[PDB]
Amino acid sequence: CSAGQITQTSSQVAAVDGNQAGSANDPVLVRDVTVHLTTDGEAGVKFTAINQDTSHTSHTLESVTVDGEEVELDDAEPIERNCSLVADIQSELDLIEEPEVGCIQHVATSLENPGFAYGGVVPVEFVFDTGAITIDATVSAPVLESGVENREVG
């Protein structure tokens, strides 16, 4: 009964803190969208834009805004088909490489925090030269270095 047309495994979603928008039919997807606000102060938007348009129209990420606040994201060249534009705050992009194989592009980004609350949700608009996406996204802290951070009495 569990191998049916509705199964538990086939329903499951990515155990990640960000949201996603786009289907099998949509030309441009966004994956793992989340407003990353550090516990020190820095903030930004984490996301991955993915072009999969079969008409081979490139999409340039023109602008990103979070609860109406503009995002600074360093210069990105357009996303051709089966290319990916990765984005995070620079402190977290320094922890991974930028592949020479395939088509991946890392761009740092940052927000001026108006005072978002941890745990909450805010609407995020991606605007491409072809169109637009709107998606709710949770405000969250970035991940830690695994296995180094003990907690203390304070």
């Binding site: 108006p114 005072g115 978002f116 609350a117 745990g119 909450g120």
Partner: peptide, 24 residues
């Protein structure tokens, strides 16, 4: 045979928004 105080909320969740005050 159902609890008489266990209804669905008539009003839908409005997708509200939070914030915190700050020094700057």
């Amino acid at each position: 045979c159902s609890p008489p105080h266990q209804q669905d909320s008539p009003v839908q969740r409005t997708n509200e928004i939070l914030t915190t005050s700050q020094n700057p």
